Each structure stands twice: as C-alpha cells, then as structure tokens.
Amino acid sequence: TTFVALYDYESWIETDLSFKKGERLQIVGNWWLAHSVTTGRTGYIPSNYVAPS
C-alpha cells in the first residue's frame, strides 16, 4: 500500500509528483497513482523510484 522513495524526483507537469528520497507515498503499470501526505498532492510516480515500506 505504502512505498518509500529511493531517489529524489522532480516533476514540472501537473500529472506527476515531486518527491524526496525517503518520502512515504500511498499507492492509489509503469507509473502509479500515489498520494503524498507530506504535500497533500495526488499524482503519478515512476515505479522504479520507489520500494515497499
């Protein structure tokens, strides 16, 4: 359900989240719809940037 970011990721498009290494992301293909309690945003993240909690 929850995954942790392995690396920093920066997004400039409204569909994708930016996140920092170590950020916990709730998972709502290659890109997963996720929610960040840190920022309150919901958006896609690349699955190769995260690992299970």
Binding site: Y7, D8, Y9, T15, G29, W31, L33, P46, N48, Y49
Partner: peptide, 10 residues
C-alpha cells in the same frame, strides 16, 4: 498515464 516508459534514474 500509467503505461508511459520508466524514466532514467537520477
């Protein structure tokens, strides 16, 4: 949106 190719690592 989910089926896009994976981006490279940093």
């Amino acid at each position: 949106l989910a089926r896009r190719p994976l981006p490279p690592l940093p």
